[PDB]
Design a protein around this nucleic acid. Structure first.
Ligand SMILES: OC[C@H]1O[C@@](CO)(O[C@H]2O[C@H](CO)[C@@H](O)[C@H](O)[C@H]2O)[C@@H](O)[C@@H]1O
Ligand SMILES: OC[C@H]1O[C@@](CO)(O[C@H]2O[C@H](CO)[C@@H](O)[C@H](O)[C@H]2O)[C@@H](O)[C@@H]1O
Ligand SMILES: OC[C@H]1O[C@@](CO)(O[C@H]2O[C@H](CO)[C@@H](O)[C@H](O)[C@H]2O)[C@@H](O)[C@@H]1O
Ligand SMILES: [Mg+2]
Length: 580
DNA sequence: GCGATCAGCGC
DNA sequence: CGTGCTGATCGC
């Protein structure tokens, strides 16, 4: 039966109590400068629905929203906070965010709406958002009666669920993680997203023109060498040309056909001149379609800024993700793509971009957690970790390490940092699974502490059912007991990797909170723009660079205290590209 | 229109 | 046989 509530035509005092579940509904997935379709408030006085036009124009309600002493419980408060920021309204006092609470309790559940979170506690008196709004082209805000009941039911669920969610977090020893880390970070992410990053669109357009030129040249060359025209961007069509018309060997196949991935094309290059051209085409095409045209599509015409959205409740490792646009994967490895970064500039005249990154934070975290004497000593001496790993696994002095040895040691470390299988390592180094496994073995012989940790963490995951990070983030691994070798092995690798990657996530998140506190104490105009897993990107007046060179690295390095030092490198320049 | 498949970017 | 995200193609 329907849920009782007052569909108010004006704001009343009882709607402004010092404790309430609040819903400020933004239906558009991208909430930047998006519409607020409705508001719901549930407190000790009852349940209320308010039309945005009314509430947001009412000075009492606005003041209530901005009053830090008036506590609010919400679901995805960042969405509401940002939508309100675009309307010039401040949201304060959010003491509980159900989305973040559910995320910390179990990232694997994929909770993306109130209904999903509520179902965790057998509460189902609320509908999934998709059921109410639909999806895709059929998505739309329903009539007021339907909308009002939905927002009220969501607010009611939040009101009822706060206590049980907080109680379980306390049992998991995650209450501080929510209240002292994720919730405060949510507000910082809101400011970053709202600020956005300025884009030199003319620069991007110029690069695009140039790429279009090169693409046309290589495209014709490809048809030339192929003896016919075909859709190069079609793995299917390309596969027929390469493996049927040109008879190149089939070294790898996909579930549906011939593989044409770069790793495969690399091996085929010697056989035909068309290959190198296909590779060149893939590189330029990726830049053109994804980084030039893609970025240009989401830049705001009025300010020339891009406003990403950081998904704080998605990854199972505790990392943040970025969308519309994704600003965590802008090219940097190859010089060609790297130039894309020249397009990201300061948002004000005479300001500069400042970037600071942790040096090998994942392996330092591993040295700390595993308490491996060799690895800890390596970082205490601040050694080149890849040269050092090569020295130990290949049993040679430092001057005996060749470039190829270091490359292979670096690939092994990559595998450790990301928890890839011996198969993954074999493909990465183009060697046999046996040889790959062989390197792993040599690594454990030289880093016995790491081997002990891996064995111990796997047993711990099996016994408790989950693994944890430095700040108590948790990840359940039900597959660790599977009688299927591949499935179980993956779970075991995640058991060892999550504490590493997840703790690194915990650290940079706390650094972000500590940094903003310091920037405020110092009254610096500098502010965060982006987080890219192990690095922070800021912009600030050129006159603040010297102070940032000392402040940023220090705050980041001191975020937590490990058995080994943390080290942060930094650079600044006129564009993101120049902050190298 | 929309999901599946394949590709490649940085972490 | 680490991952999330985005874009081009392809078949229903
Ligand atoms: O507001 C971000 C927050 O919303 C969720 C759903 O609760 O994701 C939605 O919004 C994202 C940003 O536009 C989209 O990428 C995603 O597809 C959409 O469902 C959460 O996952 C996220 O933390
Ligand atoms: O000129 C466009 C026309 O060419 C084809 C090949 O016959 O595709 C080419 O151009 C596309 C757009 O630039 C690329 O995506 C593709 O990789 C390239 O081969 C046709 O599909 C298209 O109609
Ligand atoms: O030989 C023991 C060694 O094998 C691993 C897998 O690499 O774990 C296996 O053996 C354990 C018993 O000691 C089981 O609990 C586990 O499920 C099974 O895969 C290592 O963790 C262990 O050191
Ligand atoms: Mg780094």
């Amino acid at each position: 039966a329907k849920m009782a509530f007052t569909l108010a035509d004006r704001v009343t005092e009882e709607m402004l109590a010092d404790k309430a579940a609040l819903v400020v509904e933004v239906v558009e997935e991208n909430y930047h400068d998006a519409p607020i379709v409705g508001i719901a408030v549930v407190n000790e006085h009852g349940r209320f629905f308010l039309r945005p036009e009314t509430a947001l124009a009412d000075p009492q309600f606005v003041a209530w929203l901005g009053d830090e002493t008036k506590k609010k419980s919400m679901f995805d408060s960042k969405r509401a906070a940002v939508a309100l920021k675009w309307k010039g309204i401040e949201l304060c006092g959010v003491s509980f965010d159900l989305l973040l609470a559910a995320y910390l309790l179990d990232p694997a559940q994929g909770v993306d709406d109130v209904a999903a979170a509520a179902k965790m506690k057998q509460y189902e008196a609320v509908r999934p958002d998709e059921a109410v709004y639909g999806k895709g082209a059929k998505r739309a805000v329903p009539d007021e009666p339907v909308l009002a009941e939905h927002l009220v039911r969501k607010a009611a669920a939040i009101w009822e669920l706060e206590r049980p969610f907080l109680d379980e977090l306390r049992r998991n020893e995650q209450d501080r993680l929510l209240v002292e880390l994720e919730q405060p970070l949510s507000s910082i992410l809101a400011e970053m997203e709202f600020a956005g990053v300025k884009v030199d669109t003319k620069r991007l357009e110029q690069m695009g023109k140039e790429l279009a030129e090169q693409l046309g040249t290589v495209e014709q060359r490809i048809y030339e060498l192929a003896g016919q025209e075909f859709n190069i961007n079609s793995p299917k069509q390309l596969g027929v040309i390469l493996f049927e018309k040109l008879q190149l060997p089939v070294l790898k196949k996909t579930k549906t056909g011939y593989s044409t991935s770069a790793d495969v094309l690399e091996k085929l290059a010697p056989y035909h001149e068309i290959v190198e051209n296909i590779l060149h085409y893939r590189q330029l095409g990726k830049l053109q379609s994804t980084y030039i045209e893609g970025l240009l599509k989401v830049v705001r015409p009025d300010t020339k800024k891009v406003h990403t959205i950081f998904n704080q409740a998605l990854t199972q490792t505790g990392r943040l993700s970025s969308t519309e646009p994704n600003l965590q994967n802008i090219p940097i490895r190859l010089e060609e793509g790297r130039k894309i970064r020249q397009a990201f500039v300061p948002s004000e005249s005479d300001w500069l971009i400042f970037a600071a990154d942790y040096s090998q934070i994942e392996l330092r975290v591993l040295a700390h957690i595993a308490e491996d004497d060799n690895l800890m000593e390596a970082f205490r001496r601040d050694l080149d970790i890849h040269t050092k790993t090569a020295m130990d696994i290949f049993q040679v002095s430092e001057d005996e390490v060749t470039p190829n040895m270091r490359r292979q040691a670096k690939a092994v470390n990559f595998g450790i940092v990301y928890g890839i299988s011996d198969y993954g390592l074999a493909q990465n180094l183009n060697i046999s699974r046996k040889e790959a496994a062989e390197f792993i073995e040599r690594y454990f012989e030289s880093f016995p502490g790491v081997k002990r940790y891996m064995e111990n963490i796997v047993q711990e995951a099996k016994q408790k059912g989950y693994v944890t990070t430095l700040l108590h983030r948790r990840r359940y691994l039900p597959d660790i007991t599977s009688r299927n070798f591949n499935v179980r092995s993956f779970a075991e690798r995640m058991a060892m990797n999550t504490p590493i990657q997840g703790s690194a996530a915990d650290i940079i998140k706390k650094a972000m909170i500590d940094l903003n506190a310091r920037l405020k104490e110092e009254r610096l105009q500098a502010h965060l723009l982006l987080q890219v897993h192990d690095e922070l990107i800021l912009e600030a007046p050129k006159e603040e660079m010297e102070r940032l060179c000392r402040l940023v690295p220090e705050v980041m390095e001191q975020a937590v205290t490990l058995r080994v030092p943390l080290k942060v490198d930094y650079h600044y320049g006129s564009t993101w590209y120049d902050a190298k």
